[PDB]
Amino acid sequence: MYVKLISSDGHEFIVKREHALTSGTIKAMLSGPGQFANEVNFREIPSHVLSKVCMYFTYKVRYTNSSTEIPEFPIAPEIALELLMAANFLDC
Amino acid sequence: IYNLIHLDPRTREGFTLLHLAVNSNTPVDDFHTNDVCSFPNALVTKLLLDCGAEVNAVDNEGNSALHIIVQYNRPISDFLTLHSIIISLVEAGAHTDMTNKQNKTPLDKSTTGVSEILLKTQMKMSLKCLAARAVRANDINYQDQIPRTLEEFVGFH
Amino acid sequence: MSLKPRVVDFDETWNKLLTTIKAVVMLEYVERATWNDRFSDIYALCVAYPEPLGERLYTETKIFLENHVRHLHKRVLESEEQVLVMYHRYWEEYSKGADYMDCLYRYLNTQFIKKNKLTEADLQYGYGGVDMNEPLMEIGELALDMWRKLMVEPLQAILIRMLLREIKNDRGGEDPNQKVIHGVINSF
Amino acid sequence: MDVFLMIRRHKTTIFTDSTVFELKRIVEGILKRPPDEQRLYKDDQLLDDGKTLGECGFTSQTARPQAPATVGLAFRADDTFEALCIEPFSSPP
Amino acid sequence: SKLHRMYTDMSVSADLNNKFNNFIKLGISFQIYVLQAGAWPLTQAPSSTFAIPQELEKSVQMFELFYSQHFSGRKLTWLHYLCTGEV
Ligand SMILES: [Zn+2]
């Protein structure tokens, strides 16, 4: 029910798996012999951007076709390019 | 119909089959304007999409077959047709937010009230698009830093 | 950042990739950390700083699959009258291998193949095609289409003849293994 | 209850969405460690077990979907959990 | 013409009821109608705002919860004086 994400920095983030399955790439990575039983490690992603990605997961989870205005997702200026890069490899 | 959409039928200003089909069909006359060939009809566009016309066909003003729909003047007239055509257009992966020249989000160019809301019922939030808008908000170098494919993607935003 | 376009050896990367690929297709256990590490080499190849290299990788994977299917065809056609029980083994292996392989090439499928893929619409009503080329297809599509092209066509008459013969044996009352025959028929 | 909360141990982060003892039981179930051994230090201040959400003094304005409330947890160190900090994440260059 | 739109109402009402279960996938037995206000001769707007019982409010909140998604731009009208239930 809970899945572990390990960044290249070394920090480990535990997340509800129903949240994590939003991104197709993670779903495909779990599929296959690596059934892991879970924990997942990325050799190149730094911790902070992956934390922002996790916050994106939970923020999308909170509001789905929800009524009224949806609060915008704050973006830091420098990390914008890194987020654009990291969008592909997770395909969220 | 398929052999015709395969060659580019593009007119002088840049319109294609879809763009003519969706907007107001001005040259209807001599009993074509009567009892037949109602402009902004749905079945013709459905057939055209089924035959395999390009959905997000670029326009010289970048109306992109979506900014045309919102500028429909009276929405109550043939309202169900507008709902069906929006459902069909969001089908087959038409990017919702597409800006050419000055930033023309279809939400902004839309000025018909409830129709706007209909588009809001169909948008899907993606981290890629949102981040692309955020980086577009600033002025950041994106030449040779990112992979080739996303240059055209960041460029779209 | 290690997600920036860069220059790496195609040959050296393929050497390391093939070792994992061969173990995967044979349903043999592979280390999960190795699987996760290999999953990034695909992106590293698909975005190379000088020029993209997906085209060569496509044909390389194709030729590897063809070599393996040729070996399997040799082994199967070597045995005579034991094909019934042999068919199920390597069909079971190859199907799971193809599914996992299709899972593993997800980025290549999503960002490369679909752009040059033939739209299903023109394959149906449009027609419009007569070139002497094989258009780019899905990895699983390659696997299955190739498997039909290179193995079942040469070795179909004797298989169907023995299946029909076994049907008479069942009509006699005796019941052979229903699972094997059912899987063979379902393979079609 | 509908509170965006985070737990930060050294090389460990927990995301979760009405008393402190309930959260201690939840994290016990997550990590299989006794709840009394663990403890919470909000702004380097121990939180008594059973402290309900209302008296925590932080509501939706603090617990945000994009900016969840961050909470430091002193995991048990020998007898009790004190002086435990998470290593800060790498900052962009 | 007015008679023609009478018959379509039931088919519309059934479709509006058949398309009411998707996104949910109460403690009471709930069977209700969704009418086309533009067709039925029920133009008597309720002059009194009847406070819905709290037991039925959960279904009412459930009712307006899903009507937005697959019926976009459509506004609901509650005719409580016509709705009935078993106690
Ligand atoms: Zn976008």
Coordinates of C-alpha atoms and ligand atoms in Angstrom, one line a residue:
Chain A
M1 CA 0.0 0.0 0.0
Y2 CA 3.1 2.2 0.5
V3 CA 6.1 2.6 -1.8
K4 CA 9.5 4.0 -1.2
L5 CA 11.4 6.3 -3.5
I6 CA 15.2 6.7 -3.2
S7 CA 16.9 9.7 -4.9
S8 CA 20.5 10.0 -6.0
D9 CA 21.0 12.3 -3.0
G10 CA 20.1 9.4 -0.7
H11 CA 16.9 10.6 0.9
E12 CA 14.0 8.1 1.1
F13 CA 10.4 9.2 0.7
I14 CA 7.5 6.9 1.6
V15 CA 4.3 7.5 -0.4
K16 CA 0.8 6.0 -0.7
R17 CA 1.0 3.7 -3.7
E18 CA -2.4 4.9 -5.1
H19 CA -0.8 8.4 -5.3
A20 CA 2.4 7.1 -6.9
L21 CA 0.5 5.2 -9.7
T22 CA -0.5 8.5 -11.2
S23 CA 2.7 8.6 -13.3
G24 CA 2.8 5.9 -16.1
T25 CA 6.6 5.5 -15.9
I26 CA 6.5 4.4 -12.3
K27 CA 3.7 2.0 -13.1
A28 CA 5.8 0.4 -15.9
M29 CA 8.9 0.3 -13.7
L30 CA 7.0 -1.7 -11.0
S31 CA 5.7 -4.1 -13.8
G32 CA 8.1 -6.9 -14.7
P33 CA 10.4 -9.1 -12.6
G34 CA 11.3 -6.2 -10.3
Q35 CA 8.1 -6.7 -8.2
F36 CA 10.3 -5.6 -5.3
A37 CA 8.6 -7.6 -2.5
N38 CA 8.2 -1.6 -2.0
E39 CA 11.3 0.6 -2.7
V40 CA 12.5 2.4 -5.8
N41 CA 15.8 4.1 -6.5
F42 CA 16.7 6.6 -9.2
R43 CA 20.5 7.0 -9.7
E44 CA 20.3 10.5 -11.1
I45 CA 17.3 12.5 -9.6
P46 CA 18.2 14.8 -6.8
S47 CA 16.1 14.8 -3.7
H48 CA 14.5 18.2 -3.8
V49 CA 13.0 18.0 -7.3
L50 CA 11.6 14.5 -6.4
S51 CA 10.0 16.0 -3.3
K52 CA 8.4 18.7 -5.5
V53 CA 7.2 15.9 -7.8
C54 CA 5.7 14.1 -4.7
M55 CA 3.9 17.3 -3.7
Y56 CA 2.6 17.4 -7.3
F57 CA 1.3 13.9 -6.8
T58 CA -0.6 14.7 -3.6
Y59 CA -1.9 18.1 -4.9
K60 CA -3.3 16.4 -8.0
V61 CA -4.8 13.7 -5.7
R62 CA -6.5 16.3 -3.4
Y63 CA -8.4 18.1 -6.3
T64 CA -9.8 15.9 -9.1
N65 CA -12.7 17.5 -11.1
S66 CA -13.3 19.4 -7.8
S67 CA -15.7 22.4 -7.9
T68 CA -14.6 26.1 -7.5
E69 CA -11.1 27.6 -8.1
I70 CA -8.1 25.2 -7.8
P71 CA -5.0 26.8 -6.0
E72 CA -2.1 27.2 -8.4
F73 CA 1.0 25.2 -7.8
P74 CA 3.9 27.5 -6.8
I75 CA 7.1 27.2 -8.9
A76 CA 10.5 28.4 -7.9
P77 CA 12.4 30.3 -10.7
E78 CA 15.6 28.3 -10.8
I79 CA 14.1 24.8 -10.5
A80 CA 11.7 25.4 -13.4
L81 CA 14.2 24.0 -16.0
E82 CA 15.0 21.0 -13.8
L83 CA 11.3 20.3 -13.4
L84 CA 10.8 20.5 -17.2
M85 CA 13.7 18.0 -17.6
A86 CA 12.4 15.6 -14.9
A87 CA 8.9 15.6 -16.4
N88 CA 9.9 13.3 -19.2
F89 CA 11.7 10.6 -17.3
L90 CA 8.6 10.1 -15.1
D91 CA 6.0 10.9 -17.8
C92 CA 3.5 12.3 -15.4
Chain B
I1 CA -12.3 12.2 -48.5
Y2 CA -9.1 10.5 -47.3
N3 CA -7.2 11.2 -50.5
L4 CA -8.1 15.0 -50.3
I5 CA -7.1 15.5 -46.6
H6 CA -3.7 13.8 -47.4
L7 CA -2.6 16.6 -49.7
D8 CA -2.6 20.0 -47.9
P9 CA -5.8 21.8 -49.2
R10 CA -4.6 24.9 -47.4
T11 CA -6.2 28.2 -48.6
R12 CA -4.4 31.6 -48.8
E13 CA -4.9 32.7 -45.2
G14 CA -4.1 29.2 -43.9
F15 CA -7.4 27.6 -43.1
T16 CA -8.0 23.8 -43.6
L17 CA -11.1 21.6 -43.7
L18 CA -11.6 21.7 -39.9
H19 CA -11.3 25.5 -39.6
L20 CA -13.8 26.0 -42.4
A21 CA -16.1 23.4 -40.9
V22 CA -16.2 24.8 -37.4
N23 CA -16.6 28.5 -37.9
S24 CA -19.3 30.5 -39.7
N25 CA -19.7 29.2 -43.3
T26 CA -20.1 32.6 -45.0
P27 CA -20.6 31.5 -48.7
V28 CA -23.8 29.6 -48.1
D29 CA -26.3 30.7 -50.7
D30 CA -28.6 29.7 -53.5
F31 CA -30.6 27.2 -51.4
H32 CA -27.4 25.9 -49.8
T33 CA -28.1 28.3 -47.0
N34 CA -31.6 26.9 -46.6
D35 CA -32.6 23.5 -45.2
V36 CA -29.0 22.2 -45.6
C37 CA -25.4 22.9 -44.7
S38 CA -25.8 24.6 -41.4
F39 CA -22.6 26.2 -40.3
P40 CA -20.7 24.9 -37.3
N41 CA -22.4 21.5 -37.7
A42 CA -21.1 18.5 -35.8
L43 CA -21.5 15.5 -38.1
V44 CA -19.3 16.9 -40.8
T45 CA -16.5 17.5 -38.4
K46 CA -17.0 14.1 -36.8
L47 CA -16.6 12.5 -40.3
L48 CA -13.5 14.6 -41.0
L49 CA -11.9 13.6 -37.7
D50 CA -12.7 10.0 -38.4
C51 CA -11.1 10.1 -41.8
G52 CA -7.9 11.3 -40.0
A53 CA -7.4 15.0 -40.4
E54 CA -4.7 16.6 -38.3
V55 CA -6.3 17.9 -35.0
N56 CA -3.9 20.6 -33.9
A57 CA -3.2 21.9 -37.4
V58 CA -1.2 25.1 -37.1
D59 CA -2.7 28.4 -38.2
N60 CA -1.0 31.6 -39.3
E61 CA -2.7 33.2 -36.4
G62 CA -2.6 29.9 -34.4
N63 CA -6.4 29.6 -33.8
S64 CA -5.5 25.8 -33.8
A65 CA -9.1 24.7 -34.5
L66 CA -10.0 25.5 -30.8
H67 CA -9.9 29.3 -30.6
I68 CA -12.4 29.3 -33.5
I69 CA -15.0 27.3 -31.5
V70 CA -15.2 29.6 -28.6
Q71 CA -15.8 32.6 -30.9
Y72 CA -19.2 31.2 -31.7
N73 CA -21.3 34.4 -31.1
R74 CA -24.6 33.2 -29.7
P75 CA -24.0 30.0 -27.7
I76 CA -27.7 29.1 -27.0
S77 CA -28.3 28.7 -30.8
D78 CA -27.3 25.1 -31.6
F79 CA -25.9 24.8 -28.0
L80 CA -26.0 20.9 -28.1
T81 CA -23.9 21.0 -31.3
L82 CA -21.4 23.2 -29.5
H83 CA -21.2 20.7 -26.6
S84 CA -20.8 17.8 -28.9
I85 CA -18.2 19.5 -31.1
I86 CA -16.2 20.5 -28.0
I87 CA -16.4 16.9 -26.7
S88 CA -15.1 15.6 -30.1
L89 CA -12.3 18.2 -30.3
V90 CA -11.0 17.4 -26.8
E91 CA -11.1 13.8 -28.0
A92 CA -8.1 12.7 -30.1
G93 CA -5.6 14.7 -28.0
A94 CA -6.0 18.3 -29.0
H95 CA -3.7 20.3 -26.6
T96 CA -6.0 22.4 -24.5
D97 CA -3.6 25.4 -24.0
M98 CA -2.0 26.6 -27.2
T99 CA -0.6 30.1 -27.8
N100 CA 0.6 31.6 -31.1
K101 CA 2.2 35.1 -31.5
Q102 CA 0.8 36.9 -28.4
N103 CA -0.2 34.4 -25.7
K104 CA -3.7 33.3 -26.9
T105 CA -5.0 30.8 -24.3
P106 CA -8.4 29.5 -25.5
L107 CA -9.8 30.4 -22.1
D108 CA -8.9 34.1 -22.6
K109 CA -10.0 34.4 -26.2
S110 CA -13.3 32.8 -25.2
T111 CA -16.0 35.4 -24.5
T112 CA -19.2 33.4 -24.6
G113 CA -19.7 32.6 -20.9
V114 CA -21.0 29.1 -20.3
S115 CA -18.9 27.8 -23.2
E116 CA -15.8 28.7 -21.2
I117 CA -17.1 26.5 -18.4
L118 CA -17.5 23.6 -20.8
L119 CA -13.8 23.8 -21.6
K120 CA -13.0 23.8 -17.9
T121 CA -14.9 20.5 -17.6
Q122 CA -12.5 18.9 -20.1
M123 CA -9.1 20.2 -19.2
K124 CA -6.5 17.7 -17.7
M125 CA -3.7 19.0 -15.5
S126 CA -0.2 17.9 -16.4
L127 CA 3.0 18.8 -14.6
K128 CA 4.8 19.1 -17.9
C129 CA 2.4 21.8 -19.3
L130 CA 2.2 23.6 -15.9
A131 CA 6.0 23.7 -15.6
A132 CA 6.3 24.8 -19.3
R133 CA 4.0 27.7 -18.6
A134 CA 6.0 28.6 -15.4
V135 CA 9.3 28.6 -17.3
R136 CA 7.7 30.6 -20.2
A137 CA 6.6 33.2 -17.6
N138 CA 10.3 33.8 -17.1
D139 CA 13.0 34.3 -19.8
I140 CA 15.3 31.3 -19.5
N141 CA 17.7 29.9 -22.1
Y142 CA 16.4 26.6 -23.6
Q143 CA 18.8 26.1 -26.5
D144 CA 20.9 22.9 -26.4
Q145 CA 20.1 22.4 -22.7
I146 CA 17.0 20.2 -22.9
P147 CA 16.4 17.3 -25.3
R148 CA 15.3 18.1 -28.9
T149 CA 11.7 17.1 -28.6
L150 CA 10.8 19.4 -25.7
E151 CA 12.2 22.5 -27.5
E152 CA 9.1 22.3 -29.7
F153 CA 7.0 21.6 -26.6
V154 CA 8.4 24.5 -24.5
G155 CA 8.0 26.6 -27.8
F156 CA 4.3 25.7 -27.9
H157 CA 3.9 27.2 -24.4
Chain C
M1 CA 22.5 17.1 -13.6
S2 CA 22.7 13.6 -15.1
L3 CA 19.5 14.2 -17.1
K4 CA 21.2 16.6 -19.6
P5 CA 22.0 15.5 -23.2
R6 CA 25.4 14.0 -23.3
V7 CA 27.8 11.8 -25.3
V8 CA 28.1 8.1 -24.5
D9 CA 29.3 5.0 -26.3
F10 CA 26.5 3.3 -28.2
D11 CA 28.3 0.0 -28.5
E12 CA 29.4 -0.2 -24.9
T13 CA 25.9 0.6 -23.7
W14 CA 24.4 -2.0 -26.0
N15 CA 26.9 -4.6 -24.6
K16 CA 25.6 -4.0 -21.1
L17 CA 22.0 -3.9 -22.2
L18 CA 22.0 -7.2 -24.1
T19 CA 23.1 -9.1 -21.0
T20 CA 19.9 -7.9 -19.1
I21 CA 17.8 -8.4 -22.2
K22 CA 18.7 -12.0 -22.7
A23 CA 18.0 -12.9 -19.0
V24 CA 14.7 -11.0 -19.2
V25 CA 13.3 -12.7 -22.3
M26 CA 14.1 -16.2 -20.8
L27 CA 12.1 -15.3 -17.7
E28 CA 15.3 -15.7 -15.6
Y29 CA 15.7 -13.8 -12.4
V30 CA 17.4 -10.5 -12.7
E31 CA 18.5 -8.2 -9.9
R32 CA 15.9 -5.4 -9.3
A33 CA 18.6 -2.7 -8.8
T34 CA 20.1 -3.8 -12.1
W35 CA 16.7 -3.5 -13.8
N36 CA 16.2 0.0 -12.4
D37 CA 19.7 1.1 -13.5
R38 CA 19.2 -0.3 -17.0
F39 CA 15.9 1.6 -17.2
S40 CA 17.9 4.9 -17.5
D41 CA 20.3 3.7 -20.3
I42 CA 17.3 3.8 -22.7
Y43 CA 16.7 7.5 -22.0
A44 CA 20.5 8.1 -22.2
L45 CA 20.6 6.6 -25.6
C46 CA 17.4 8.2 -26.9
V47 CA 18.8 11.6 -26.2
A48 CA 22.4 11.7 -27.3
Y49 CA 24.1 15.1 -27.6
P50 CA 25.6 14.7 -31.2
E51 CA 22.6 12.9 -32.8
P52 CA 19.7 10.7 -31.7
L53 CA 20.4 6.9 -32.0
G54 CA 17.0 5.3 -31.8
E55 CA 17.0 4.2 -35.4
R56 CA 20.0 1.9 -35.0
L57 CA 18.7 0.5 -31.7
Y58 CA 15.5 -0.4 -33.4
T59 CA 17.1 -2.6 -36.1
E60 CA 19.6 -4.0 -33.5
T61 CA 16.7 -5.2 -31.3
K62 CA 15.0 -6.5 -34.4
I63 CA 18.1 -8.6 -35.5
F64 CA 18.6 -9.9 -31.9
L65 CA 15.0 -11.1 -31.9
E66 CA 15.4 -12.7 -35.3
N67 CA 18.5 -14.5 -34.2
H68 CA 16.7 -15.8 -31.1
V69 CA 13.7 -16.9 -33.0
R70 CA 15.9 -18.7 -35.6
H71 CA 17.6 -20.6 -32.7
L72 CA 14.2 -21.5 -31.3
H73 CA 13.0 -22.6 -34.7
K74 CA 16.1 -24.8 -35.1
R75 CA 15.5 -26.4 -31.7
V76 CA 11.8 -27.0 -32.2
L77 CA 12.0 -28.2 -35.8
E78 CA 14.8 -30.6 -34.7
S79 CA 12.3 -32.5 -32.4
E80 CA 9.6 -34.5 -34.4
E81 CA 6.2 -35.5 -32.9
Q82 CA 7.2 -33.8 -29.6
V83 CA 6.2 -30.3 -30.9
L84 CA 2.8 -30.4 -29.1
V85 CA 4.5 -30.3 -25.6
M86 CA 7.4 -28.2 -26.8
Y87 CA 5.2 -25.5 -28.3
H88 CA 3.7 -24.6 -24.9
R89 CA 7.0 -24.1 -23.1
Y90 CA 8.6 -21.6 -25.4
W91 CA 5.3 -19.9 -26.3
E92 CA 4.7 -19.3 -22.6
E93 CA 8.3 -18.0 -22.3
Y94 CA 8.2 -15.8 -25.3
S95 CA 4.8 -14.2 -24.6
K96 CA 5.8 -13.1 -21.1
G97 CA 9.2 -11.9 -22.4
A98 CA 7.5 -9.9 -25.1
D99 CA 5.1 -8.3 -22.5
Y100 CA 8.0 -7.4 -20.2
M101 CA 10.0 -6.1 -23.1
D102 CA 7.2 -3.9 -24.3
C103 CA 7.0 -2.6 -20.7
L104 CA 10.7 -1.9 -20.6
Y105 CA 10.9 0.2 -23.9
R106 CA 8.1 2.6 -22.8
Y107 CA 9.9 5.8 -23.4
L108 CA 11.1 4.7 -26.9
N109 CA 7.5 3.7 -27.7
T110 CA 6.0 7.0 -26.5
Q111 CA 8.4 9.6 -27.8
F112 CA 9.8 8.0 -31.0
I113 CA 7.7 5.2 -32.5
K114 CA 4.2 6.8 -32.5
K115 CA 5.4 9.9 -34.4
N116 CA 6.4 7.8 -37.5
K117 CA 3.8 5.1 -36.8
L118 CA 1.1 4.6 -39.4
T119 CA -2.3 5.9 -38.2
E120 CA -4.9 3.2 -37.8
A121 CA -7.3 5.3 -39.7
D122 CA -5.5 5.1 -43.1
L123 CA -4.8 1.4 -42.5
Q124 CA -8.6 1.0 -42.5
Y125 CA -10.6 3.3 -44.9
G126 CA -7.7 5.3 -46.3
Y127 CA -5.5 2.6 -47.7
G128 CA -3.1 4.8 -49.6
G129 CA 0.0 2.6 -49.0
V130 CA 2.1 0.4 -51.4
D131 CA 5.8 1.1 -50.5
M132 CA 8.4 -1.7 -50.1
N133 CA 9.1 -0.9 -46.5
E134 CA 8.1 -2.1 -43.0
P135 CA 6.8 1.0 -41.1
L136 CA 8.0 1.5 -37.6
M137 CA 5.8 -0.5 -35.2
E138 CA 5.5 -1.2 -31.5
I139 CA 8.1 -3.4 -29.8
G140 CA 5.4 -5.9 -28.8
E141 CA 4.0 -5.6 -32.3
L142 CA 7.4 -6.3 -33.8
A143 CA 7.8 -9.4 -31.5
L144 CA 4.4 -10.9 -32.4
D145 CA 4.5 -10.1 -36.1
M146 CA 8.0 -11.5 -36.4
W147 CA 7.0 -14.6 -34.4
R148 CA 4.2 -15.2 -36.9
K149 CA 6.4 -14.5 -39.9
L150 CA 9.4 -16.6 -39.1
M151 CA 8.1 -19.7 -37.1
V152 CA 4.5 -20.6 -37.5
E153 CA 4.3 -20.3 -41.3
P154 CA 6.9 -23.0 -42.1
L155 CA 5.7 -25.4 -39.4
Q156 CA 1.9 -25.2 -39.6
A157 CA 0.7 -28.1 -41.7
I158 CA 2.1 -30.9 -39.5
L159 CA 0.8 -29.2 -36.4
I160 CA -2.7 -28.8 -37.7
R161 CA -2.6 -32.4 -39.0
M162 CA -1.6 -33.8 -35.6
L163 CA -4.2 -31.6 -33.9
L164 CA -6.9 -33.0 -36.2
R165 CA -5.6 -36.5 -35.5
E166 CA -5.7 -36.0 -31.8
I167 CA -9.3 -34.8 -32.2
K168 CA -10.1 -38.3 -33.5
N169 CA -8.4 -39.8 -30.5
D170 CA -10.6 -37.7 -28.2
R171 CA -13.6 -38.8 -30.2
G172 CA -12.5 -42.3 -29.3
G173 CA -13.0 -41.3 -25.6
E174 CA -9.4 -40.8 -24.3
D175 CA -8.7 -37.3 -23.1
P176 CA -5.2 -35.8 -23.8
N177 CA -3.9 -32.7 -22.0
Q178 CA -6.6 -30.1 -22.6
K179 CA -4.5 -27.2 -21.3
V180 CA -1.7 -27.7 -23.9
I181 CA -4.2 -28.0 -26.8
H182 CA -6.2 -25.0 -25.5
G183 CA -3.1 -22.9 -25.3
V184 CA -2.0 -23.9 -28.7
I185 CA -5.3 -23.0 -30.3
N186 CA -5.6 -19.7 -28.3
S187 CA -2.1 -18.8 -29.6
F188 CA -3.7 -18.5 -33.1
Chain D
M1 CA -8.2 15.1 9.5
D2 CA -7.6 16.7 6.1
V3 CA -4.3 18.0 7.3
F4 CA -1.2 18.0 5.0
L5 CA 1.6 16.9 7.2
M6 CA 5.2 15.7 6.8
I7 CA 7.6 13.8 9.1
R8 CA 11.3 14.5 8.6
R9 CA 13.9 12.0 10.1
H10 CA 17.5 11.8 9.0
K11 CA 17.3 10.2 5.5
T12 CA 13.5 9.6 5.9
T13 CA 10.4 11.6 4.9
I14 CA 6.8 10.7 5.4
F15 CA 3.8 12.3 3.7
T16 CA 0.4 12.0 5.2
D17 CA -3.0 13.7 5.1
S18 CA -7.4 13.8 15.3
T19 CA -4.8 13.6 18.1
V20 CA -1.0 13.3 18.1
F21 CA -1.3 9.8 19.6
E22 CA -3.2 8.8 16.5
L23 CA -0.4 10.0 14.3
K24 CA 2.1 8.1 16.5
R25 CA 0.0 4.9 16.1
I26 CA 0.0 5.5 12.3
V27 CA 3.7 6.0 12.1
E28 CA 4.1 3.0 14.4
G29 CA 2.2 0.9 11.8
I30 CA 4.3 2.4 9.0
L31 CA 7.7 1.7 10.6
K32 CA 7.0 -1.0 13.3
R33 CA 8.4 1.0 16.1
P34 CA 6.7 1.7 19.5
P35 CA 4.9 5.1 19.5
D36 CA 5.9 6.2 23.0
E37 CA 9.6 5.7 22.0
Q38 CA 9.0 8.1 19.2
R39 CA 8.0 11.7 19.8
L40 CA 7.2 15.0 18.0
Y41 CA 9.0 18.3 18.3
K42 CA 7.1 21.0 16.6
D43 CA 9.5 24.0 16.3
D44 CA 11.7 22.2 18.8
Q45 CA 8.8 21.8 21.3
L46 CA 7.6 18.4 22.5
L47 CA 4.0 17.6 21.6
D48 CA 2.1 15.8 24.3
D49 CA 0.4 12.6 23.2
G50 CA -3.3 13.0 22.6
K51 CA -3.0 16.6 21.6
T52 CA -6.0 17.1 19.2
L53 CA -5.8 18.9 15.8
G54 CA -7.8 21.9 17.1
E55 CA -5.3 22.8 19.8
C56 CA -2.3 22.2 17.5
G57 CA -3.1 25.8 16.4
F58 CA -2.4 25.0 12.7
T59 CA -5.3 24.6 10.2
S60 CA -5.8 24.4 6.3
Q61 CA -3.9 27.7 5.9
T62 CA -0.7 25.9 7.2
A63 CA -1.6 22.4 5.8
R64 CA -1.4 23.1 2.1
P65 CA -1.6 20.7 -0.9
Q66 CA 1.4 22.3 -2.4
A67 CA 3.1 23.3 0.9
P68 CA 2.2 20.7 3.5
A69 CA 2.9 21.4 7.2
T70 CA 6.4 20.1 8.1
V71 CA 6.9 18.4 11.5
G72 CA 10.1 17.3 13.1
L73 CA 10.0 13.9 14.8
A74 CA 12.6 12.8 17.4
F75 CA 12.9 9.1 16.8
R76 CA 13.9 7.0 19.8
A77 CA 17.6 7.3 20.7
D78 CA 18.4 4.8 23.5
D79 CA 15.8 5.6 26.2
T80 CA 14.1 8.5 24.5
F81 CA 14.0 10.5 21.3
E82 CA 15.9 13.8 21.5
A83 CA 18.4 15.8 19.4
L84 CA 17.5 14.2 16.1
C85 CA 17.6 16.2 12.8
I86 CA 17.0 15.5 9.2
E87 CA 19.9 16.2 6.8
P88 CA 18.9 19.1 4.5
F89 CA 18.3 18.3 0.9
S90 CA 20.7 19.5 -1.9
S91 CA 20.0 23.0 -3.1
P92 CA 20.1 23.9 -6.8
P93 CA 23.4 25.6 -7.9
Chain E
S1 CA -44.7 19.8 -30.7
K2 CA -45.5 20.3 -27.0
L3 CA -46.8 16.8 -26.9
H4 CA -43.8 15.4 -28.7
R5 CA -41.4 16.8 -26.0
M6 CA -43.6 15.1 -23.4
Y7 CA -42.6 11.6 -24.6
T8 CA -38.9 12.4 -24.9
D9 CA -38.9 13.5 -21.3
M10 CA -39.2 10.0 -19.9
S11 CA -36.4 8.7 -22.2
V12 CA -34.3 11.8 -21.2
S13 CA -35.2 11.2 -17.5
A14 CA -34.2 7.6 -17.7
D15 CA -30.9 8.5 -19.4
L16 CA -30.3 11.2 -16.8
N17 CA -30.8 8.5 -14.2
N18 CA -28.7 5.8 -16.0
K19 CA -25.9 8.3 -16.3
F20 CA -25.9 9.0 -12.6
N21 CA -23.9 6.1 -11.1
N22 CA -20.4 6.4 -12.7
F23 CA -18.2 8.6 -10.6
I24 CA -19.7 7.3 -7.3
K25 CA -18.1 3.9 -8.0
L26 CA -26.4 6.8 2.1
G27 CA -28.3 4.5 4.3
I28 CA -31.6 5.1 2.6
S29 CA -33.5 3.7 -0.5
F30 CA -33.1 6.4 -3.1
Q31 CA -35.1 6.4 -6.3
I32 CA -35.6 9.8 -8.1
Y33 CA -36.3 11.6 -11.4
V34 CA -34.3 14.1 -13.4
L35 CA -36.6 16.2 -15.5
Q36 CA -36.1 18.6 -18.4
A37 CA -37.4 21.9 -17.0
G38 CA -37.7 23.2 -20.6
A39 CA -40.3 20.6 -21.5
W40 CA -42.5 19.5 -18.6
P41 CA -45.5 21.8 -17.8
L42 CA -44.1 22.1 -14.2
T43 CA -43.1 25.8 -14.5
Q44 CA -44.4 26.5 -10.9
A45 CA -41.2 27.7 -9.3
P46 CA -41.2 26.8 -5.5
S47 CA -42.2 29.9 -3.7
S48 CA -40.9 28.5 -0.4
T49 CA -37.4 27.3 0.3
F50 CA -38.1 23.9 1.9
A51 CA -35.2 22.9 4.2
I52 CA -34.1 19.4 3.2
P53 CA -34.0 16.9 6.1
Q54 CA -30.5 16.1 7.2
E55 CA -31.0 12.4 6.5
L56 CA -31.9 13.2 2.9
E57 CA -29.2 15.9 2.6
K58 CA -26.4 13.3 2.1
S59 CA -28.2 12.0 -1.0
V60 CA -28.9 15.5 -2.2
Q61 CA -25.3 16.5 -1.7
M62 CA -24.4 13.2 -3.5
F63 CA -27.0 14.1 -6.2
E64 CA -25.4 17.5 -7.0
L65 CA -21.9 16.0 -6.6
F66 CA -21.9 14.1 -9.8
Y67 CA -24.3 16.0 -12.0
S68 CA -21.4 18.4 -13.0
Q69 CA -19.0 16.0 -14.6
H70 CA -21.0 14.1 -17.3
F71 CA -23.6 16.9 -17.5
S72 CA -21.6 20.0 -18.1
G73 CA -23.2 23.4 -18.0
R74 CA -26.5 21.9 -16.9
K75 CA -28.3 23.3 -13.8
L76 CA -30.5 21.3 -11.5
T77 CA -33.9 22.2 -10.2
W78 CA -35.4 20.5 -7.2
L79 CA -39.1 19.9 -7.0
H80 CA -39.4 18.7 -3.4
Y81 CA -43.2 18.8 -3.4
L82 CA -43.1 16.0 -6.0
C83 CA -40.5 13.8 -4.4
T84 CA -41.7 11.1 -2.0
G85 CA -40.1 8.5 0.2
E86 CA -40.8 5.7 2.7
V87 CA -40.5 6.2 6.5
Ligands
ZN1 ZN 0.3 22.5 -22.2

